[PDB]
Amino acid sequence: NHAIKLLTSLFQDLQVEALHKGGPPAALSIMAQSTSIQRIQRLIDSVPLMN
Amino acid sequence: FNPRTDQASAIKTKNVFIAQNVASLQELGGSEK
């Protein structure tokens, strides 16, 4: 449940970013500022997300 | 369409309508405009 909620929040911020449909994976750090796309990219790279 | 959430039903309808308007605005990028 918690993982699903976090995914929802991150993808929703990614959508706030791609307003009107508009890098390397986000580093694993609190100060690792990156694009919302890169954050989702890190999650996808780490684990098959949809699967 | 996805709702994505009888006296309060009208309020829900209004809420849905409101969300739709906001979405359209963002799609149009009207906020930036």
From Swiss-Prot, chain A:
Component of the SIFI complex, composed of KCMF1, UBR4 and calmodulin (CALM1, CALM2 or CALM3). Interacts with E2 conjugating enzymes UBE2A and UBE2B. Interacts with RB1. It comes from Homo sapiens. The UBR-type zinc finger forms a pocket that mediates recognition of type 1 N-degrons. In addition to substrate-binding, the UBR-type zinc finger probably positions substrate proteins in the proximity of the bound and activated E2-ubiquitin conjugate to enable their ubiquitination. Constitutes an atypical E3 ubiquitin-protein ligase composed of a hemiRING-type zinc finger, a UBR-type zinc-finger interacting subdomain (UZI) and an N-terminal region that can serve as an affinity factor for the E2 conjugating enzymes UBE2A and UBE2B. Compared to classical RING-type, the hemiRING-type only binds a single zinc ion: a hydrogen bonding network is present instead of a second zinc ion. Coiled coil: none annotated. E3 ubiquitin-protein ligase involved in different protein quality control pathways in the cytoplasm. Component of the N-end rule pathway: ubiquitinates proteins bearing specific N-terminal residues that are destabilizing according to the N-end rule, leading to their degradation. Recognizes both type-1 and type-2 N-degrons, containing positively charged amino acids (Arg, Lys and His) and bulky and hydrophobic amino acids, respectively. Does not ubiquitinate proteins that are acetylated at the N-terminus. It is found in: Cytoplasm; Cytoplasm, Cytoskeleton; Nucleus. Belongs to the UBR4 family. Disulfide bonds: none annotated. Transmembrane segments: none annotated. Signal peptide: none annotated. This is E3 ubiquitin-protein ligase UBR4. The lineage of its organism: Eukaryota, Metazoa, Chordata, Craniata, Vertebrata. It is linked to Episodic ataxia 8: A form of episodic ataxia, a neurologic disorder characterized by episodes of poor coordination and balance. EA8 affected individuals have attacks of unsteadiness, general weakness, and slurred speech. Additional variable features include twitching around the eyes, nystagmus, myokymia, and persistent intention tremor. Inheritance is autosomal dominant.
